[PDB]
Amino acid sequence: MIIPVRCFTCGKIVGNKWEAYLGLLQAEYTEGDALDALGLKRYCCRRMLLAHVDLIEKLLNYAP
Amino acid sequence: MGTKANLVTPRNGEPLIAAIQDFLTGAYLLTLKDTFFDRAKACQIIASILVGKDEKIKVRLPPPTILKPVTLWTGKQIFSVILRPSDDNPVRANLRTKGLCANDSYVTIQNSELMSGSMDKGTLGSGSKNNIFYILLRDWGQNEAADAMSRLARLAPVYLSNRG
Amino acid sequence: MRSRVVLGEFGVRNVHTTDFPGNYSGYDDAWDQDRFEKNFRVDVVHMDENSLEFDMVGIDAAIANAFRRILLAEVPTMAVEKVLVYNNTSIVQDEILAHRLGLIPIHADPRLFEYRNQGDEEGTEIDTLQFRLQVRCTRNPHAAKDSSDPNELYVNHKVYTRHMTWIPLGNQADLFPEGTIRPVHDDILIAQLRPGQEIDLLMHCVKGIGKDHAKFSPVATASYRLLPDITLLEPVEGEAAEELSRCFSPGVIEVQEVQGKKVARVANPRLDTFSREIFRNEKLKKVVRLARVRDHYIFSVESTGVLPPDVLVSEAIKVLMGKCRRFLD
Amino acid sequence: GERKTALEMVQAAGTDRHCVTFVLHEEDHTLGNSLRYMIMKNPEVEFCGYTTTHPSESKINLRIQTRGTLPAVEPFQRGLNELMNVCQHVLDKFEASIKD
Amino acid sequence: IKAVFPCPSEPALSKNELILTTESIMKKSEFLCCQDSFLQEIKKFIKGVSEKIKKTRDKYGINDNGTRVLYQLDRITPTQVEKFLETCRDKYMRAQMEPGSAVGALCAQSIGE
Amino acid sequence: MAGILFEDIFDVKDIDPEGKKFDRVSRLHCESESFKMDLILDVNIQIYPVDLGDKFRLVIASRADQFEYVMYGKVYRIEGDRLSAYVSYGGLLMRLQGDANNLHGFEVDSRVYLLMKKLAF
Secondary structure (H helix, E strand, C coil): CCCCCECCCCCCECCCCCCCHHHCCCCCCCHHHHCCCCCCCCHHHHHHHHCCCCHHHHHHHCCC | CCCCCCCCCCCCCCCCCCCCCCHHHHHHHHHCCCCEECCHHHCHHHHCCCCCCCCCCCCCCCCCCCCCCCCCEECHHHHCCCCCCCCCCCCCCCCCCCCCCCCCCCCCCCCCCCCCCCCCHHHHCCCCCCCCCCCCCCCCCCCCCCCCHHHHHHHCCCCHHHCC | CCCECCCCCCCCCCCCCCCCCCCCCCCCCCCCHHHHHHHCCECCECCCCCEEEEEEECCCHHHHHHHHHHHHHCCCCCCCCEEEEECCCCCCCCCHHHHHHHCCCECCCCCCCCCCCCECCECCCCCCEEEEEEEECEECCCCCCCCCCHHHHEECCCCCCCCEEEECCCCCCCCCCCCCCCECCCCCCCCCCCCCCEEEEEEEECCCCCCCCHHHCCCCCCCCCCCECCCCCCCCCCHHHHHHHHCCCCCCECCCCCCCCCCCCECCCCCCCCCCCHHHCCCCCCCCCCCEECCEEEEEEECCCCCCHHHHHHHHHHHHHHHHCCCCC | CCCCCCECCCCCCCCCCCCEEEEECCCCHHHHHHHHHHHHCCCCEEECCCCECCCCCCCEEEEEEECCCCCCHHHHHHHHHHHHHHHHHHHHHHHCCCCC | CCCCCCCCCCCCCCCHHHHHHHHHHHHHHCCCCCCCCCCCHHHHHHHHHHHHHHHHHHHHHHHHCCCCCCCHHHCCCHHHHHHHHHHHHHHHHHCCCCCCCCCHHHHHHHHHC | CCCCCCCCCECCCCCCCCCCCCCCCCCCCEEECCCCCEECCCCCCCCCCECCECCCCCCCCCCCCCCCCCECCCCECCCCCCCECECCCCCCCCCCECCCCCCCCCCCCCCCECCCCCCCC
16 A cells, blocks of 8 residues: 555565656656666666555545 | 384385475585595584584594595595494485496495585485485384484585585 | 685575684684784775775684674664553554654663663663653645645654754763754654644654664664675686676776777776676676685675664674673683 | 583493584584584594484584594594584684785 | 395296296195185186296296307296295285275275265 | 495487476496496586596595585495496486496495596696
8 A cells, every 4th residue: 555665575674665757657757767867777676666565645535 | 103103104115204304405415426525524514413402422533534735524424424333334326327327326335434415315315225214214223213313404504504 | 716706607506614623624723813813904995974884804614604693683773662641632543653753763771771660660770761652633725725645734744853952960061962863864754743643652762772772773784795806717808808898787897999009907806796697798707707815805894873874883893792602711 | 611512422432432413502503513523524423413303493403423432522522623624624724815 | 035035046047847846845835725715726826837847937038049148148047936936936925815805985985975 | 424336437429408497417327437337327427528527436335535426315226137236326327337357335225325527627
């Protein structure tokens, strides 16, 4: 539902890096290059952002 | 039905207990004529016969089976390792062709060493007449088959974790 | 032969560190310092803020992997082990948030605390760096630009690790808490909040060791290379330089001349993360020979803000001292 | 202070100190194989023998087995002290290189 | 019995006749057979025929092959054949069902599964 | 350690290295240039350059000691049809095949208890 703070098989910290892509997907790099200007040089964190579904927004659309 | 039920069935006459899987290929790879080992690879020995409960006698350190510029331990008598209650055995006729044809058959085990050959499901698993049972259940009795299977179960599949 | 690993197209040979006294008829080093403290040295590479790299020269595999394994999860650091609950109104909760926070790196040195035996709050005297998290979200009250972004109609719509205000236990108040107590990162999305929700917690920052639950790792990059030393035999001087500069990684092999054909031999044989196409030119692979060498176990450690990587590697190499001489009496 | 750790096991010792299985309690591969390394590196030992027998990694039954004459405490401590010297000299050469 | 070697013996007398003498001590040594029986006499003579053909093969080998390691000594010794017959008696008298034996359900599931 | 009593000189016939992935496991066929006898060695091939090598002055025992292989285990001894052994090394067979003109060295537990040899020559 939310962003794993750690790359399940790497260790690197991640949760700090989702409100940059939603500001670096509108500078409009290719996803593969929004995830090179922030540090992710392995498999792991590339999964942990490319693959994740921010159900946070849509769920909170009607939380109460 | 605890020690005689497991290994011998009257419905078929064939063992039920056997290296299910990778024990087969791990032990095979041990037996492969390639694999040359180290005295430093007395490590993997010691989950088998220098090992968990009910096996900690010594082991006779099978001799240095090369004395070249480079001493080395062949892969077979690292399989054929135990040094409590010495025994004797024999086998033959693995799953390959006939003639010294890059030999993966007529293993010809003598009295607990490993002369030639390389194992298989029909020479280390649920075969019929050549096994670690019908050569170590009949001659020599029970209690020496349920304790060579364990030295395999901890010897071979903790070799793959060093080969992949 | 004797510490030259080889990288055949099918499998890696020469890999057991087969040099022990009485396992080679050359000579094997009844091993210690004089032959070992002369060959040893620790170069340094790039040193920087949370990433460190260096090239130990003369170890063998066992002590090097001992370092690796100790840096990962056999070194202690400051991270949450418990979360007290006060009005957790928010969305998904109580074990992810608990564990989210459990995963936030607090930045207190793990050499001025001790372990935690069964005490008052399980213990409240030395260890409990206690963190207070009082985040409230509501409606930004001046939004005549109706129906806009969440960033403009809400107020602290998210819960970053900048709302983690520190609580003082009279113990610590004067030594650490001048500003070196906050979590490393002041931006982590712990849980979004929509109008009418709050969170309030207490964060029992116990000591711990990585084996317990790896949220105590300080390090991320504790895994490494040996060092490649890729040879050449009577080279392929000329235009083949194009091939033996696109097969290997982009900086690895120079391409210098054409008249002096000179497929320009090794330029930087440490930048190559072994793509290994070179066995599939089928006309070159029988020239190059690949060899990662057994001396230089090039390290590259990176932290998670808790400590500078130098502090982490020094702590690991001293915890090995502790382990080795705790069985030596 | 190794009273509840080094539970040696010479019982049917063929050589006087033969089946000397230091059952190192609360232990992993980390020290285990480094020790195993240094021990195996003396021309009087034949097993460094380190093999964690349990599922859970706490009891590394290092079954050193010397060439018969010696005890096995003598190598054990030679190796532990040798690893002391090695790691301390490594730190000495290392932290004096951070000045680079 | 190959794998437990009683070294002292050699080919001097063409042991085929010595093998027949061991067949005689055989003929004596399981005519003390009998117990819950009808399981050994029915095969005792075929045992004898089998060792007789073994002796014939040994004769052919010791003649042609030897026509000096004594042709590997062509191992066979009186001790080996005595141990051989003792093992034969052991397994023949051990594989004896009734007494026992609970033969029914075993066959039932044998034909079933 | 040498109750040998071989004293040979040798050369070689044919490699067969497609068998074992260790090229340093390959079927030597060397026939005796002492009399005629053949030996299926399984050398850890390193420096044998002729079609299978060089001088093989095998001194098969029980001198600068270049002389390498020994297993200390179990054997097989056919009579052949040509008395013949199979000197296994737990993976390195050596079928000595010849006559009784050669000296002793045998037992059926001891024709693995054997030394070997390379150049000193």
